[PDB]
RNA sequence: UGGUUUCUCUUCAGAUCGCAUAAAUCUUUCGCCUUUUACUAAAGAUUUCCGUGGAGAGGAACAACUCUGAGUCUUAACCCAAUUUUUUGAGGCCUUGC
């Protein structure tokens, strides 16, 4: 296999090819312009791996050209989803706590360096300097114990075979205290909706049906038309004004010509989940939010009572099955809380996702909103709903091709080596290379 | 005579007040408002008209954010409170006629429909 | 196991009992145990001669019971 | 393609039987025609999916899906309703092992679709009511209690979704027992109000009312749980033990026997302890203890999960543990076979409400005998559509005689009377289909008592009619037309857009009139089409 | 519990033939079959060792004193074992 | 050890000898602890087990069908012919 | 009964996926509108790209085994002797049939 190279190699190549004015490097001038056509892909792989405000330094695998023509970041950011949502919820908490507790927040100057100022050398200027502590909320050592060792690492439980597989970092298996702690760390970014009966008319198929017609929804998306002696007004009782969402709820019965219409899922059994406040109360007790029973009936029915002198006695080696085990532990109510929880938190185990594919704010623009809000954010929620519905509509399935693997084809050649560099050094390289 | 429907609504406690409002806005007369035993939801059993029962379900789930849930069955027939034969009452073209002459309005509309 | 024979249906009914040795008796079922030993009341021995003689209430050991037939409807 | 009826592609991998189905069809007392009704989706569909997932192995496994062996359309499979009353037939055993034959009419649960439930209910002799634990007695539950009382059938409720007591309401065991007892008491009250008869009172000790959660495939009756309890332990008589479990009955741990009050030292019932306590042990140790102390619990239950099975999510793991602990769905088979009067007995009270004449000395005894011979008669009531074809099959049950393929058919209509033979006409059987919900399989003959699809008689059968032998001196009446729970009130005026295709629209209107049993499509004096619905 | 016993219970409700230890032959409907082979039957035809027949409404034969039973062929189609 | 001695002959056609001296020939499909036997397509012989008796091979043969024999009354079994394929 | 991390290649997979969501071409319409790009907002027909699965082959290796969990001659003491079975109410005799 082609192996890793010392990280000083690409550093000296980039540094000797300074601005390509030496006569000694006049044969590599042609290759840098050739590498110009792959600068957008290098930019994409660069910014895809940006290091995540709870990280001081990220070391990325770098695929570089042997003349220093271009530096790629040969890595995909797999970020296991409960950990990523918990870390950004922790970021949300620390940022609100920092913004309220700071006398003056000085905003950065946005062209940070000057125009005639040459870019800094990475080597001295940043290899010497200490990295200035990241955000990293202080975790309770007793309450947040199964998370505290690994929570602000790069790819947290990567080198332990019990919680993930290997270093491809593709599958994860957690224990329920970990899921409970990660689920309560993410509450600032999550919702309180246990069932989707909230989304009766405000769901996806309803918005498809609204796109099919010219109808909009009061908090929903607005679209463009897709189609562009019987109904006598003396012969029709207008008893109730036909409210417009009837055309969504029952599309055939309320419209003429329902073409390209989608059917709607209209009811789920209302999930009644009693959220327990404090651990002093047991796992399952009769909560005072539930209406009592109070058995009452008219005449006692003759339900069978096999009386005495039935002489049926149980033998000695029989008991209730699991009376040896206790009725509940400290982790039972937490697991029942985990059963009604959003998609990453209702599960023990899953596949790792990319950092791109986790929308932290998606459940916020998917819900309709309390009217006291400004006009601005109402239009914004409506527009984000429009973008989501246009995503869900025009979803052609993945179209199974032959996989291409561009970077595996570059590093099979004799012109690319591979190393491991700090992300800031690669970003300074990519900027100098584009210049 | 007018048909009425029997409606059961399953709803939370403030949603019961919401159902009371919406169902009262359709000539309702709520029959029963008992809570459900062993559950934090309430059952609202009520009558409703059948000309007033076009979209009550959808309006209810709109106004309760999908918490209440309504089902409706036919069981009933009672008198429309208007005088069905009256020539003093002049009916407007489109405007919804009040309770004193709904029977005259309905008879005129069904007369113009087929029978003439 | 240690099962009962399913004979409650036949309790207090008149029965015809075929026993080993080509022996036959008739009487009313008054009870039984898991071995199929029977209590038969108003029992009558049906002698091979054809003659029948009243023997009263008796115990038949289930061991020697070949077959029984109800003379009633169950 | 003009097919939207979801993949018939007939390949049942059911457990070695193909002939055994038709052999139990020929026994005529070993067949149970049950229908399943409830207020709304109370798990009736998932439940039958669990029964079939029991039945058919090596395929028929679902992760967050399936539950569509009633839900086989595409508008049906996206709305959430089951709009059609898709029947199914299976053979599945009892606690003992004598495998019965079950014809399940899997009805809807919506108030607007009472037609389907009624038409299934008139063709089957027993009804199974599903009440959600966390709901209680509801609107359509009361309506179907009415309609079950009216058309003279056996009655059994079955409390489904009992997990919602455990995992959603999080009730204590004794409070949950109080809630279940309240549900049973309300069922008995609603029955006692309506039925003049009194020999139908349901109680868990009697064996008819069952307990079965069905996202996780629990199903026990008192007999079935006592069967499990005695199969693990020694030689307890599980019927007599099951007799003494429900209802204010306490276990004295020194005298080792069941009393009515005698330990009053804040104890619990025999049901509460023996049933609900280890059940909540299983539930809690799965949903909160899976990593810590679950295999310790499994080794005390004889449940061996493999390494790959122990790494599932909590819902598939809970379903798998409850499947390996409860096994087959034989408590349901107990409450069926002990309380469905399989159609020897079923003949008489049904025929004394369907048939126009009555008990009388020609037809009545011929029906009540119900041997697969004699004066060939039927009652088809449902009209199920094919995928592409205009033709749509009739569905009914053979009362007397048999049906052969190619045997011609006199379709006695309902506008027919005895001295008016102009309505009835003659056909010939195209094909005989018997269905496992999307598995349609052909038979050469169908004997008495069994359900059957008929191909080729579809032109005279508007909603209700009776099949008889052609040109045979057997003269008989019709069965009564269908009394409905609701009367069709909502009137809709209807007219086409383009007036050049009135005949094709009247054709399709006649087809949907024939398809739904309460659709009323008539033309009033002004010449505008009028559709009455529910 | 034995494999043949399960198959016997399966024949409950079917017409079966039974020969005793003494060679009397009983044909009719099997109502109940116990674990020990105790057999309740109805509407019987009995064929004695001399060849003569008789008719009985209701019978019950002890398992031990049964030589064998003939069951329908409807059952033949427990092939796992 | 193996338990196979019965399981080997399963599905085969088998000649079974009863305590009264009858010969039951059928397809051996199942057995149990007591040696209660399940015999498909079973016939009974009385007079002989033929080894090609030039006069005739078969006298007092009776077709029985599906037979369950109680083990109490079984004496012995030998292989009569191979399994029918069906 | 042979571990499982990891790297590369080949092949096949998208009718409920990748529980995420870009861009391009063509053909019809539009909508603004000096004209062309660059566009708007739809429809349909196609592609590219960022990622994924199943299977097979091969390598990399600081990194894992053969009286072992039981087997085709050896480890579950319990399927080992009061009527419902693996311990006989047996014993005796005689007639009929090629
Ligand atoms: N909590 C819980 N939910 C269940 C159970 N079984 C099914 N469900 C859910 O309850 C809803 C109704 O189930 P279905 O069987 O699809 O509906 P149905 O009860 O057949 O009623 P119809 O749709 O009218 O036939 C579905 O969303 C099921 O997933 C259960 O055992 N427990
Ligand atoms: Mg359903
Ligand atoms: Mg020009």
Measured CA angle at F48 (ends F46, F53), to 5 deg: 150
Q: Contact C58/C10 with Cβ under 8 angstroms?
A: no
Q: Contact F53/F85 with Cβ under 8 angstroms?
A: no
Say how far apart CA A423 and CA A62 lie, in whole Å. Answer: 9
Q: Contact D336/D126 with Cβ under 8 angstroms?
A: yes
| Closest C-alpha among A355, F20, A12, B6 to residue D111 | B6
Chain-chain contact of E65 with C73 (C-beta, under 8 angstroms): no
| Closest C-alpha among A151, A138, A140 to residue A83 | A151
Q: Which residues form the domain of E36?
A: 1-81
* Three-state DSSP class for residue D322: helix
Q: Give the nucleotide with minimal C1' distance to the Cα of E63.
A: G84
Q: How far is CA F44 from CA E48, F17, F24, F39, F81, in A?
A: 18, 10, 5, 11, 16
Chain E residue with CA closest to D231: the answer is E1
Q: Contact A62/A143 with Cβ under 8 angstroms?
A: no
Cβ < 5 A residues, ion ligand 2: D 45, 70, 82
* Three-state DSSP class for residue A185: helix
Read out DSSP for A169-187?
--EEE--HHHHHHHHHHTG
Chain A residue with CA closest to D257: the answer is A313
Q: Contact D175/A290 with Cβ under 8 angstroms?
A: no
Q: How far is CA D467 from CA A78, C10, D123, D202, D428, in A?
A: 67, 44, 14, 36, 11
From the CA of A178 to the C1' of G20: give the distance in Å: 25
Nucleotides of G under 7 A from a protein CB: 4-9, 11-22, 41-44, 48-53, 59-60, 72-73, 79, 83-86, 89
Chain-chain contact of E68 with F68 (C-beta, under 8 angstroms): yes
Q: Is D268 left (phi over 0), alpha (psi -120 to 50) or beta?
A: beta
- Specify the CATH number for the domain of residue E76: 2.30.30.100
Backbone dihedral angles phi then psi of residue B39, each to the nearest 5 degrees: -155, 150
| Closest C-alpha among F31, A166, A311 to residue D240 | A311
Beta strands in chain C (DSSP E): 14-19, 23-32, 38-46, 52-60, 65-70
Residues in chain A: 435
Backbone dihedral angles phi then psi of residue A57, each to the nearest 5 degrees: -140, 130
- Return the exposure string of A141-161: e unless at least 16 CB atoms fall within 10 Å of the residue's CB, then b: eeebebbeeebbeebbbbeee
Q: How far is CA D461 from CA D94, D152, D375, D385, D530, in A?
A: 38, 25, 20, 14, 21
Q: Which helix (H) or strand (E) holds B13?
A: helix B13-24
Q: Contact D78/A265 with Cβ under 8 angstroms?
A: yes
Q: Which helix (H) or strand (E) holds D236?
A: none
| Closest C-alpha among D383, D513, D520 to residue D455 | D383
* Atom in ligand 1 nearest the alpha carbon of residue D108: 24
Q: Contact B4/B27 with Cβ under 8 angstroms?
A: no
- Paired strand residues for E60: C68, E40
Output the six-digit token pair for A190: 């999550």
Check residue A294 and report its DSSP letter: -
Say how far apart CA D465 and CA D62 lie, in whole Å. Answer: 40
| Closest C-alpha among C49, F10, A312, C32 to residue C68 | C32
The closest CB to that of A339, out of D167, D178, D233, belongs to D167
Read out DSSP for C39-57?
EEEEEEEE-TTS-EEEEEE
The owner of tokens 């109904």 is A231
Q: Contact D480/D354 with Cβ under 8 angstroms?
A: yes
Q: How far is CA D480 from CA D144, D356, D381, D413, D518, in A?
A: 20, 6, 12, 11, 15
Say how far apart CA B42 and CA B36 lie, in whole Å. Answer: 5
Say how far apart CA A268 and CA D111 lie, in whole Å. Answer: 16
| Shortest alpha-carbon distance between residue F51 and chain E (Å) | 27
| Closest C-alpha among D120, D337, D117, D341 to residue D208 | D337
* Three-state DSSP class for residue E41: strand
- Paired strand residues for B88: none
Q: How far is CA D415 from CA D122, D411, D480, in A?
A: 20, 12, 11
CA of D384 to the centre of ligand 1 (A): 24
- What's the domain count of chain E? 1
Read out DSSP for A328-352?
--TTHHHHHHHHSS-TTTS-SEEE-
* Three-state DSSP class for residue F64: strand
Distance of CA A266 to the CA centre of its chain: 27
Q: Contact D394/D408 with Cβ under 8 angstroms?
A: no
Say how far apart CA A53 and CA A67 lie, in whole Å. Answer: 33
Say how far apart CA D524 and CA D44 lie, in whole Å. Answer: 41
Domain ranges of chain F: 1-86
D106 is in an annotated binding site: yes
Residue nearest to ligand 1 atom 9, measured at CA: D43
Neighbours of C12 (CB within 10 A): 11
Say how far apart CA D23 and CA E14 lie, in whole Å. Answer: 11
* Three-state DSSP class for residue D142: helix
Read out DSSP for B10-79?
EE-HHHHHHHHHHHHTTS--EEE-PBPTTSS-EEEEEEEESSS-SSHHHHHHHHTTT--EEEEEEEEEE-
Measured CA angle at A92 (ends A89, A95), to 5 deg: 150
Q: Contact D141/B10 with Cβ under 8 angstroms?
A: no
Q: How far is CA D416 from CA A404, D425, D479, D516, in A?
A: 73, 10, 11, 21
Say how far apart CA A407 and CA A412 lie, in whole Å. Answer: 9
CA of A261 to the centre of ligand 2 (A): 23
Say how far apart CA F16 and CA D370 lie, in whole Å. Answer: 42
Q: Contact A406/A41 with Cβ under 8 angstroms?
A: yes
* Three-state DSSP class for residue A286: coil
Read out DSSP for F9-46?
TTTSEEEEEETTS-EEEEEEEE--TT--EEEEEEEEE-
Check residue A45 and report its DSSP letter: H
Say how far apart CA E12 and CA E37 lie, in whole Å. Answer: 12
Q: Give the nucleotide with minimal C1' distance to the Cα of F34.
A: G85
Q: Which helix (H) or strand (E) holds B44?
A: strand B42-49
Longest CA pairwise span in chain B (Å): 56
Q: Contact A180/A337 with Cβ under 8 angstroms?
A: yes
Say how far apart CA D60 and CA C9 lie, in whole Å. Answer: 44
Distance of CA A125 to the CA centre of its chain: 36
Burial class (CB in 10 A: 0-12, 13-18, 19+), F63: exposed
Instruction: Considering only CA atoms, give the Rg of chain A.
Output: 31
Method: cryo-EM
Neighbours of B12 (CB within 10 A): 17
User: Both ends of chain C: CA-CA distance in Å?
Assistant: 26
Domain ranges of chain C: 1-74
D396 is in an annotated binding site: no
Say how far apart CA E74 and CA F43 lie, in whole Å. Answer: 18
Is E22 an 8 Å CB contact of chain C? yes
- Pocket test of ligand 1: the residue of D43, D109, D129, D162 to mutate, having most ligand atoms within 8 Å of its CB, is D43
- Residue numbers after which chain B breaks, C to N beyond 2.5 angstroms: none
* Three-state DSSP class for residue F24: strand
From the CA of A161 to the C1' of G64: give the distance in Å: 14
Check residue A373 and report its DSSP letter: S
Say how far apart CA D450 and CA D343 lie, in whole Å. Answer: 9
Inter-chain Cβ pairs, chain A and chain B, closer than 8 A: 75
Distance of CA D345 to the CA centre of its chain: 19
Q: Which helix (H) or strand (E) holds A315?
A: none
User: Both ends of chain B: CA-CA distance in Å?
Assistant: 20
CB hemisphere CA count around D398 (13 angstroms)? 28
Chain E residue with CA closest to F40: the answer is E76
The closest CB to that of C6, out of E32, E58, E65, belongs to E32
Longest CA pairwise span in chain E (Å): 42
Measured CA angle at E56 (ends E53, E61), to 5 deg: 100
At the second CATH level, the architecture of C1-74 is Roll (2.30)
Angle between helices B56-63 and B13-24 (to 10 degrees): 140
The closest CB to that of A348, out of D182, D274, D314, belongs to D314
Measured CA angle at A260 (ends A259, A265), to 5 deg: 115
From the CA of D299 to the C1' of G78: give the distance in Å: 21
Q: Contact D76/D85 with Cβ under 8 angstroms?
A: no
Say how far apart CA D105 and CA D116 lie, in whole Å. Answer: 9
Angle between helices A176-185 and A332-339 (to 10 degrees): 60
**Sheet with D126-132, side-by-side order of all strands:** D87-92, D100-106, D31-38, D126-132, D154-160, D210-212
From the CA of A226 to the C1' of G27: give the distance in Å: 17
Is D237 an 8 Å CB contact of chain E? no
- Paired strand residues for D390: none
Q: Contact D370/D395 with Cβ under 8 angstroms?
A: no
Measured CA angle at D258 (ends D254, D262), to 5 deg: 70
The owner of tokens 């012995």 is F76
Angle between helices D314-326 and A332-339 (to 10 degrees): 110
- Paired strand residues for D246: none
CA of D43 to the centre of ligand 2 (A): 7
* Three-state DSSP class for residue B104: helix
| Shortest alpha-carbon distance between residue E8 and chain D (Å) | 9
- Residue numbers after which chain E breaks, C to N beyond 2.5 angstroms: 77
CA of D163 to the centre of ligand 1 (A): 12
| Shortest alpha-carbon distance between residue C57 and chain E (Å) | 21
Please give all residues whose beta carbon lies within 6 A of any atom in ligand 1, as ranges.
Answer: A 269; D 40-46, 67, 81-82, 108-109, 161, 163-164, 213-215
Distance of CA F8 to the CA centre of its chain: 14
Backbone dihedral angles phi then psi of residue D132, each to the nearest 5 degrees: -55, 130
Q: How many helices (H) and strands (E) does chain D have?
A: 17, 21
Residue nearest to ligand 1 atom 14, measured at CA: D43
Chain-chain contact of F70 with E76 (C-beta, under 8 angstroms): no
* Three-state DSSP class for residue F30: strand
The owner of tokens 């056909």 is D427
CA of A266 to the centre of ligand 2 (A): 14
Q: How far is CA D476 from CA A209, D28, D356, D393, D447, in A?
A: 53, 23, 9, 24, 20
CB interface of C with E, residues 44-73, below 8 Å: 62, 65-70, 73
Q: To what resolution in angstroms was this structure determined? A: 2.9
């Amino acid at each position: 296999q082609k192996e890793d190279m010392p990280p000083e190699h690409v550093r000296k190549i980039i540094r000797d090819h300074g601005d390509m004015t030496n006569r000694k490097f006049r044969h590599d001038k042609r290759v840098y312009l050739g590498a110009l056509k792959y600068m957008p892909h290098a930019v994409l792989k660069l910014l895809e791996n940006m290091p995540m405000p709870w990280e001081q330094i990220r070391d990325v695998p770098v695929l570089y050209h042997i003349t220093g023509a271009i530096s790629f970041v040969n890595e995909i950011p797999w970020v296991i989803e409960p950990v990523y949502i918990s870390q950004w919820g922790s970021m949300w908490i620390m940022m609100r706590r920092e913004k309220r507790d700071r006398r003056h927040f000085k905003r950065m100057r946005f062209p940070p360096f000057d125009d005639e100022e040459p870019p800094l050398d990475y080597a001295d200027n940043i290899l010497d300097v200490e990295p200035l502590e990241a955000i990293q909320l202080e975790l309770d050592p007793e309450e947040d114990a199964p998370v505290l060792d690994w929570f602000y690492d790069h790819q947290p439980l990567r080198d332990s075979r019990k919680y993930v597989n290997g270093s491809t970092y593709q599958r994860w298996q957690f224990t329920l205290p970990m899921m409970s702690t990660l689920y309560r760390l993410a509450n600032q970014l999550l919702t309180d909706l246990v069932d989707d009966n909230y989304f009766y008319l405000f769901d996806l198929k309803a918005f498809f049906t609204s796109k099919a017609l010219n109808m909009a929804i009061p908090g929903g998306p607005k679209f463009e038309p897709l189609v562009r002696e019987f109904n006598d007004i003396n012969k029709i009782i207008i008893r109730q004004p036909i409210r417009t969402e009837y055309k969504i709820a029952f599309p055939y019965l309320y419209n003429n010509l329902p073409h390209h219409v989608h059917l709607t899922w209209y009811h789920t059994p209302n999930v009644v989940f009693i959220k327990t406040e404090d651990p002093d109360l047991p796992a399952f007790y009769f909560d005072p939010l539930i209406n009592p029973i109070s058995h009452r009936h008219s005449v006692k029915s003759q339900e069978p009572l096999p009386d005495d002198d039935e002489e049926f006695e149980l033998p000695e080696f029989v008991e209730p099955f699991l009376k040896d085990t206790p009725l509940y532990t400290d982790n039972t109510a937490n697991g029942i809380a985990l059963l009604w929880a959003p998609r990453p938190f209702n599960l023990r185990s899953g596949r790792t996702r990319r950092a791109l594919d986790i929308p932290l704010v998606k459940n916020w623009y998917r819900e309709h909103c309390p009217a006291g809000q400004p006009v601005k954010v109402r239009v914004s929620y409506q527009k984000l709903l429009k973008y989501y519905v246009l995503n869900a509509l025009k979803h052609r399935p993945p179209k199974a091709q032959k996989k291409r693997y561009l970077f595996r084809s570059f590093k099979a050649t004799k012109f690319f080596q591979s190393t491991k560099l700090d992300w800031v050094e690669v970003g300074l390289q990519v900027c100098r290379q584009g210049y | 005579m007018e048909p009425y429907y029997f409606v059961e609504v399953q709803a939370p406690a403030d949603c019961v007040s919401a159902v009371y409002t919406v169902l009262a806005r359709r000539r309702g007369h709520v029959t029963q408002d008992a809570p459900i035993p062993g559950s934090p939801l309430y059952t609202i059993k009520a009558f409703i008209p059948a000309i007033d029962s076009f979209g009550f379900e959808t309006d209810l789930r709109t106004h309760t954010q999908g918490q209440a849930f309504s089902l409706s069955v036919f069981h009933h027939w009672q008198i429309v409170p208007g005088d069905p034969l009256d020539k003093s009452i002049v009916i407007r073209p489109l405007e919804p006629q009040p309770a004193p002459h709904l029977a005259r309005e309905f008879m005129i509309k069904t007369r113009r429909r087929k029978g003439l | 196991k240690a099962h009962p024979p399913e004979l409650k249906k036949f309790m207090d009914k008149k029965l015809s009992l075929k026993l080993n040795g080509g022996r036959h008796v008739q009487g009313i079922l008054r009870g039984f145990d898991p071995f199929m030993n029977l209590v038969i009341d108003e029992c009558v021995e049906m002698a091979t001669s054809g003659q029948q003689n009243n023997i009263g209430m008796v115990v038949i050991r289930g061991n020697s019971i070949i077959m029984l037939e109800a003379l009633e409807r169950v | 393609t003009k097919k939207f009826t979801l993949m018939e592609q007939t390949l049942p991998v059911t457990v070695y039987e193909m002939d055994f189905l038709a052999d139990l069809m020929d026994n005529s007392e070993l067949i149970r025609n049950v229908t399943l009704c409830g207020h709304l989706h109370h798990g009736k569909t998932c439940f039958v999916d669990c029964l079939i997932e029991q039945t058919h192995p090596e395929i028929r496994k679902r992760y967050d899906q399936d539950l569509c062996y009633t839900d086989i359309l595409f508008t049906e499979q996206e709305r959430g309703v089951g709009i059609k009353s898709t029947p199914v037939t299976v053979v599945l055993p009892d606690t003992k092992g004598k495998s019965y034959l079950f014809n399940i009419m899997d009805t809807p649960g919506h108030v607007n679709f009472s037609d389907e439930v009624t038409a299934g209910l008139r063709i089957s002799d027993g009804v199974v009511l599903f009440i959600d634990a966390a709901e209680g007695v509801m609107l359509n539950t009361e309506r179907l209690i009415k309609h079950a009382v009216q058309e003279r059938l056996a009655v059994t409720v079955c409390i489904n979704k009992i997990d919602r007591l455990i995992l959603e309401l999080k009730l204590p065991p004794t409070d949950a027992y109080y809630k279940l007892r309240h549900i049973v008491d309300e069922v008995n009250g609603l029955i006692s109000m309506y039925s003049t008869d009194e020999n139908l009172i349901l109680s868990p000790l009697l064996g008819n009312v069952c307990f079965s959660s069905s996202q996780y495939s629990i199903c026990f009756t008192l007999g079935s749980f006592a069967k499990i309890y005695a199969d693990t332990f020694g030689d307890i008589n599980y019927q007599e033990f099951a007799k003494r479990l429900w209802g204010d009955i306490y276990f004295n741990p020194k005298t080792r026997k069941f009393t009515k009050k005698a330990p009053t030292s804040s104890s619990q019932r025999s049901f509460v302890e023996f049933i609900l306590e280890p059940l909540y042990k299983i539930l809690a140790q799965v949903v909160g203890d899976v990593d810590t102390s679950l295999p310790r619990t499994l080794d005390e239950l004889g449940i061996h999960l493999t390494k790959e099975e122990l790494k599932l999510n909590i819902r598939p793991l809970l379903r798998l543990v409850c499947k390996k602990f409860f096994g087959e769905f034989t408590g349901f088979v107990d409450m069926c076979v002990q309380h469905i009067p399989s159609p020897k007995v079923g003949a008489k009270p049904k025929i004394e409400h369907t048939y126009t004449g009555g008990v009388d000395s020609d037809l009545g005894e011929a029906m009540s005998d119900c041997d697969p011979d004699g004066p060939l008669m039927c009652h088809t009531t449902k009209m199920y559509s094919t995928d592409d074809g205009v033709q749509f099959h009739a569905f009914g049950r053979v009362l007397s005689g048999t049906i052969h393929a190619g045997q011609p058919v006199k379709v006695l209509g309902e506008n027919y009377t005895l001295e008016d033979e102009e309505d009835s006409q003659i056909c010939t059987v195209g094909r005989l289909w018997i269905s496992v919900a999307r598995y349609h399989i052909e038979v050469n003959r169908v004997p008495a008592g069994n359900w059957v699809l008929i191909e080729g008689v579809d032109q005279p059968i508007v909603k209700t009619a009776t099949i008889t032998e052609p040109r045979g001196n057997e003269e008989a009446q019709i069965f009564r037309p269908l009394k409905f729970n609701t009367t069709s009130v909502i009137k809709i005026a209807v007219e086409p857009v383009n007036p050049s295709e009135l005949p094709k629209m009247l054709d399709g209107l006649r087809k949907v009139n024939k398809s739904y049993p309460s659709l009323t499509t008539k033309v009033e004096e002004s010449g505008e089409h009028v559709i009455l619905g529910t | 519990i034995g494999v043949p016993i399960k198959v016997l219970h399966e024949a409950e409700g079917h017409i079966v033939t039974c020969e005793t230890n003494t060679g009397e032959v009983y044909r009719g409907k099997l109502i109940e079959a116990e674990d020990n082979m105790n057999c309740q039957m109805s509407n019987i035809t009995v064929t004695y060792r001399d060849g003569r027949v008789a008719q009985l409404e209701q019978v019950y034969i002890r398992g031990s004193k049964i030589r064998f039973l003939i069951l329908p062929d409807m059952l033949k189609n427990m092939l796992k074992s | 050890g193996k338990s196979s001695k019965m399981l080997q002959h399963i599905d085969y056609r088998m000649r079974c000898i009863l305590q009264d001296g009858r010969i039951f020939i059928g397809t051996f499909k199942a057995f149990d602890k007591h040696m209660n036997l399940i015999l498909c397509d079973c016939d009974e012989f009385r007079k002989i087990k033929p080894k090609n008796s030039k006069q005739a091979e078969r006298e007092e043969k009776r077709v029985l069908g599906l037979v369950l024999l109680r083990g109490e009354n079984l004496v012995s079994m030998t292989v009569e012919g191979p399994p029918p394929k069906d």
